[model samples]
Target: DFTFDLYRALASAAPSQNIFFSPVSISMSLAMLSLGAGSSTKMQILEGLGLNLQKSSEKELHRGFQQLLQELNQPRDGFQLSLGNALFTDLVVDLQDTFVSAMKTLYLADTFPTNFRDSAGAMKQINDYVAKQTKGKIVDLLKNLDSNAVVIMVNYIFFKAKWETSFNHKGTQEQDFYVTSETVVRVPMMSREDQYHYLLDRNLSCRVVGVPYQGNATALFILPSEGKMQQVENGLSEKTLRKWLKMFKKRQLELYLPKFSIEGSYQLEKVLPSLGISNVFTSHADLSGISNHSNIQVSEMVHKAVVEVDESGTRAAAATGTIFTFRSARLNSQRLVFNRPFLMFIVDNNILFLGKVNRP
Candidate 1:
């Protein structure tokens, strides 16, 4: 539910521009925070995540995440994927043993001690870790840090996968990409003719297609009818998504998708409040499970994502940091050209990347 809610919120926030983010990265970061929360704080985080604490035990929740993360991090041939987490704390504070052990054992998070008084050095340490984890695709995750910061958490995901059926380079050509009804730009569009799973959603006025990667992962592309982008976006939901996947059928057709690259970042300080996660950012936050003191509160939550798609394959990276000072497939043969605005996502067991290509 947090995934769908966050997706709608971000889509609503920027309806006209391109949108891309890693919902898994965001959820994992919050899951780590949930470990350091107690009482109402823990309840709030769970509720915000659309999880009913009454029905799910704390151990059950973390255990589910632990299994999910392990499966996602499992190695695959012809695929490169990585997910990492870390906790940074001011040297003056001592993290609780339970919190530290759980994070290290379950979440595989590394702990680091830093002097918040040296804000530049602290910021560099966090950013450099993110950059290196993401293979330099992400840089400068945090620009500044509060001198009184008590705890900070960071998570990153990076993926590189090749297509199961590669597009021919000789067929690539500069084609017009419709940014809007009145605007158009030339882009290097990759073309391919092959069998693919496709679906036509007349209710939403959109065409859905699934393109497989070398591993079990796949990229789902959604192309709305002319001028119906808003309508399709407004109807986005888990039910609708599942229906599309179920309705797809195999077909052979020529496909044209732009060879594009895009990146996005979100502060999430204000955005998260809209999702019922407001206490963590305020003095009312109950994060005592993290340490003996009650003064620590999340200062900010930041996320950055980058993706590149071409004829050969895709390279994508995303990072989520908490400053503690605190914080598929086919259908018939038909010509489908994603020349206009379209929504796309790379998915395996969960969504790895979500984005809209409007200009590219």
Candidate 2:
């Protein structure tokens, strides 16, 4: 539900634009930060995550996340996925023993005693780590840095996998993609004739297809009727998505998915507040668990993601710097050309990435 909320918020913020993000990367960073938060800040962060104390204690929440991360890391020959977290704690402050232990034990986060006095150098050091973790796919994660900031938590993930049925390179060709009513751009569209899980939602006027990866993951591509993107987005929810997934039936399809690479960078300091996570970014924030010696507030949060889809498969990477702030169906043998704006979700047990391919 939090994933859907975050996706809708981002999509609404940029209509008819390519939107891509790593919900896990951003959410994990916040969940990790919540270890240090207290009072209103803690509740607001937990509330934003769609978690309540009654159902899930903080210990349970953290432990559940720990289990989920371990589950995702289970050995699989078909895919390569790396999910990680890091703490770049400034030298001036001392993080509590309990907070550090939780991060290291539960979240498996690496701790790096940082020198924040050199803003530019700190940015480089952080960016270097991001690039290394994501295999250079998420390079330069922190383009700018705040010397005054105390602790910078980072969550980064990289995944590469082949489709269950890969598209052929010879079948790729330049084709027209309708970006808007008046705009059409030529793109190298990858074509494949294969059986796939699909759903057609007449009420929503959209087609949904599930393209499985060789691993236990799949990409749910949602193509709405031209001019119906807004309505489809408005009607989107976990219930609707679960129904679409349940309703999918296997069928042969002539799929035309554009071979494109997209990178999305977002400044979420302002947007995160919409989820009731406003206090952590304000001056009144109580983050004493991190360090009581200095006053700390989340000054900024920058998230960047990249997705490369082509004839072979897909490679994706995303990074969230907590400065801190922090699906479908269809088909029968019917042909589906995703030539217009559409939503794409790279999902497994959890959503890995959410995106919109508008111009691709």
Candidate 3:
């Protein structure tokens, strides 16, 4: 059966929280395999999980992903696939009930830390069982889940690739970059001249560039006319992004993108409320489809992402908590830009992945 719809729905939910938090430089890819899981079951789980279906459009969904590719300079040649499932059976249900019963053994009269070791371990057990059942079509996941973190909502992504065009290591040099009007820092800029996706935006006063991926997609890069960087960032909207993408046509242009790799993670509780999913994290909300439980709420959300860019392709991965809260926020930036490396990623419609990298 075509599980595309199921996969897409889960994919959307997985990143919804991520997008709400960082707002840029995040890319997540998902692949779904249907085992004994039915479509209605998957849909029901998603509904209980509180995923917003309206934003699942292909155009709107892929926004900011290209930025992820360019910023990380990820190698683009490996197969990356993410898989998820919901197994149904009398034995499984009995086992789940038993697990919950076991957890109740530790329920304290007083508030506990929700250490989540049990929750995480349960997830891994469930993932392993599903992988075994799928016979390896799906590998890596959480199986034995906490009622706190359920099959109601879960996310996984896999990425593999080696850079198609390796940077000319010999020419790497420290160069000055203007991050802002008042700031300039030296960074190792990797230079390369090859056929790249290029377009000129006279109206935006910027040059639009594309870095080809092994497949149909290419990383779209926009460089504002000298000092108009903020203008570009500020003027960026969904409509403008669509217009810019439609304007892309293959052309030859001089390309000088920095080489960088960055790794980062964040707790999304605060960030998500700022976007529109306030009810998701609140106990008063409704997510009954995963279980008969109504008071169930998202306790924490975590996001981990990494991207690296060079000559050949782009490789990236983002993993986040399904219902648990994250402990800390981590951001890693590297590049030889001005003296201090701020933040940089290749963006076209929406920001993709963000990262820091060395030029050599």
Candidate 4:
């Protein structure tokens, strides 16, 4: 029941358009289902029930997922907002509610339908909601959201402050960023002039930078030396990932990080079968908790994410869906890296369950 295979599956789902696996997304979704339905054990049991092999035709499986999603609408309601201070405050309150053992989830839905609503008006409501909720600690979410927002069945938002020591904005300078050797673009490079737990694994030959987050965790950035980004990305795997992380050394080394903000939107339909998660959207999937007598399938999984980092902190948001089957399944995954003057994010394990580069 308690299997790392489940963890690996969740991790594998992280980069998929229809799925999200940030610690917040994974933990909260599980927690929400647990709290709402009662018992993490029950929820775990529900997931376990998934492996039972009851032969259903592709059409039947699809119909089942479609019916199930229609009945669960909470994931598609209201606007969600959180500031550094506000997030901290809520975490404290949440701790009181469930302590370390407690599970809590916060979900938001887009109020405007893509076809009927003006994009701007829909975005305004989202921003307005954020402003009211966080008071003033979160002003940027609304400011940058219009350009970064999208309509989805469900959306997830997570924010976390980096360690007290962060990259120095003062040392940031314009530099040539090679997206590919054939294309060298000049971008602003954010340099950190501090002693860090750094290493240059001759075997790997890429510089590794480890940045600590708020708690007992850290975010590691791997920059391939010059033209090796492709090579590094190509070689990435779960085993390699762990090995890369373990190679860190507490040493003083100068680090130059690209000051980039990544904002992306993805469609879920295309990515699921590629990842072996077809059952979740099929009648074979037991979503009885969602409905007792109907065949429903997830029509789509749209995901939108934004990560912006300046001298102050990092802010990001992601929205996902399990739409009506037979409707249209659309997913768009986009990454906006701001360097000269874009956005960046604090890397935290708790906040980010999985991060990777997909080479096409």
Q: Compose the digit string of candidate 3's lDDT tens values, residues 310-331.
A: 5444432112344244547533
Give the Å error, residue 100, model 3: 14
Clashes of each: 18, 8, 53, 38
Query: After superposition on all CA atoms, what RMSD does each candidate show versus the true structure?
Result: 10.2, 9.4, 15.4, 17.0
Tens-digit per-residue lDDT, 151-249, candidate 2: 676666666777766687887899999989889999998888677898989888889999888778898999998789988887788788778978899
Worst 10 residues of 3 by lDDT: 29-38
- The sequence of per-residue lDDT tens digits that candidate 1 reaches over residues 1-360 is 677778778878876888877887777778888888877877778787677646567677778778888887787666667667777878866778888898888887776877878888899989998888777867877867877676676666666677877777887899988898789899998888767899999999999999999787899999999899888877787788888889989987789888877767776776888988888877788988888776777766777777767777443211124312321333434799999999988887778888777787
TM-score each candidate. 0.89, 0.89, 0.50, 0.52
Identify the runs in model 1 with alpha carbons over 4 angstroms from their true place.
Answer: 144-150, 313-333
- Pick by TM-score: 2 or 4, better one: 2
Kindly report which residue stretches of model 2 are placed more than 4 angstroms away from their true locations once superposed: 53-55, 313-333
lDDT of each: 0.79, 0.79, 0.39, 0.39
Better of 1 and 4 by lDDT: 1
Residue 209 of model 4 has an lDDT of 64
Model 2 residue 229 CA deviation (Å) reads: 0.9
lDDT of 3: 0.39
